[PDB]
């Protein structure tokens, strides 16, 4: 299966993140990552919940569709409470195991929620080096938040298993993968619990890392 | 099962430029590096660098570096080595090897597959 | 440019004896580490790689170890024409590249 992976990448800027992606010492940022707000910066929305930079938490994603081998570097993770990898296939489903090559080869990410569906949202990284994630849809709830994950505080009803749209499993944590750290380079210091979670009564047994 | 198929012998006149040529088995390489190491007549093996085909990335070693050029295609079956202004120093033979490489997850080092050897003799 | 220092440069031994050659290296090194033999006129045999794992069809008696910055080989009962140059190797860094050692040569003794 490792030859499902789309493997597109040029780096002509030199970001480094190529490196990263094969060599454990050559991993990437905290002047970057001073966009993300805290939860406590934005303000409650009470009104009933409807659904609407991508490593801050409080991204607002589009809802996942199928996007183009061409556009994808490295491996994609789509996270049900859990980590799950998607490899690349055709137009119609079928796998296609080379590496990527075929420009009419695709990676289907379509999402619908857990527990009726697969998967909360998916992370990749397109080709310039650039972390891109979609999910959900995300739930609206100077300082608007729309919701991707599980903002408990500002809306009650507004939770990971409600509105969750990726990685993001509360503002402050991450689910743990082993491409964590190259998708999100600056939770690098992040510190890791062993967590649980209930959606539709199976238990998600998964790391995760917090702040 | 791959299985590499490199060029013919060669002979060039002193300050040329000679190509070698290195194909591959499996149709094309992936997500594998394609390296080159040279052995003078009774000295050591001298690696060279190598090209990564998939992506395009260049090594030069600085023993060579301005006169040797690698290239290939993303999914070509040959990948190249040229060099520039020879001289009877670069009198040997030329190896180029397929290997996959990583430290991290689902890409780890594996495979050693070596070309038959290339010699480059270097006379007027 | 990590560099692989090899030593012996010569080894003088006969056959029933063990054979111990050492590899330092200027820096830490990731494992993947491979030792390589030579006979004249032939191409280099991968013997052990991974640090300690013998490659398809090599003898129990050639034996890896090492770690960090220094690696040993160790023969066991050498046989006739086990007697050849060996090699040192690394594979890793970005851009991937190769380092190679210097060599040993292994003589009969006399």
């Known amino acids: 299966h490792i030859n499902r992976t789309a493997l597109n990448c040029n780096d002509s800027l030199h970001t480094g993140f190529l490196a990263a992606l094969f060599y454990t010492h050559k991993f990437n940022c905290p002047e970057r990552m001073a966009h993300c707000r805290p939860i406590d910066e934005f303000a409650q929305g009470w009104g009933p919940i409807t659904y609407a930079r991508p490593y801050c938490w409080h991204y607002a994603p589009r809802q996942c569709g199928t996007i183009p081998a061409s556009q994808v570097c490295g491996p994609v993770y789509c996270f049900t409470p859990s980590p799950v990898v998607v490899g690349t296939t055709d137009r119609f489903g079928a796998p296609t195991y080379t590496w990527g090559e075929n420009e009419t080869d695709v990676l289907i990410l379509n999402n619908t929620r857990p527990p009726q569906g697969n998967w909360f949202g998916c992370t990749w990284m397109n080709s310039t080096g650039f972390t891109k994630t979609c999910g959900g849809p995300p739930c609206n709830i100077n300082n608007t938040l729309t919701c991707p994950t599980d903002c408990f505080r500002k809306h009650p009803e507004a939770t990971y298993t409600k509105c969750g749209s990726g990685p993001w499993l509360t503002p402050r944590c991450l689910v743990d993968y082993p491409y964590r750290l190259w998708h999100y380079p600056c939770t690098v210091n992040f510190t890791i619990f062993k967590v649980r979670m209930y959606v539709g009564g199976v238990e998600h047994r998964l790391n995760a890392a917090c702040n | 099962q791959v299985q590499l198929v490199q060029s013919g012998a060669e002979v060039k006149k002193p300050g040329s430029s000679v190509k070698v040529s290195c194909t591959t088995s499996?149709?094309?390489?992936?997500?594998?590096?394609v390296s080159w190491v040279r052995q003078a007549p009774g000295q050591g093996l001298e690696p060279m660098g190598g090209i990564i085909p998939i992506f395009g990335t260049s090594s030069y070693a600085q023993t060579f570096q301005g006169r040797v050029t690698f290239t290939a295609g993303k999914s070509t079956s040959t990948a190249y080595m040229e060099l520039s202004s020879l001289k009877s120093e670069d009198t040997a033979v030329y190896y180029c090897?397929?290997?996959?490489?990583?430290?991290?997850?689902?890409?780890?080092?594996?495979?050693?597959?070596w070309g038959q050897g290339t010699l480059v003799i270097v006379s007027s | 440019e990590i560099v692989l220092t090899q030593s012996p440069a010569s080894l003088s031994l006969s056959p029933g004896e063990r054979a111990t050659l050492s590899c330092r290296a200027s820096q830490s090194v990731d494992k993947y580490f491979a030792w390589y033999q030579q006979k004249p006129g032939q191409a280099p045999r991968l013997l052990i790689y991974?640090?300690?794992k013998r490659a398809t069809g090599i003898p129990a008696r050639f034996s890896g170890s090492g770690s960090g910055t220094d690696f040993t080989l160790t023969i066991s009962n050498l046989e006739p024409d086990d007697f050849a140059i060996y090699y040192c190797?690394?594979?890793?860094?970005?851009?991937?590249?190769?380092?190679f050692g210097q060599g040993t040569r292994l003589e009969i003794k006399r």
């Open positions: 991974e640090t300690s």
């Open positions: 090897v397929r290997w996959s490489f990583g430290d991290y997850g689902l890409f780890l080092t594996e495979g050693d597959y």
């Open positions: 499996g149709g094309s390489f992936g997500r594998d590096a």
């Open positions: 190797h690394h594979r890793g860094n970005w851009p991937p590249s190769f380092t």
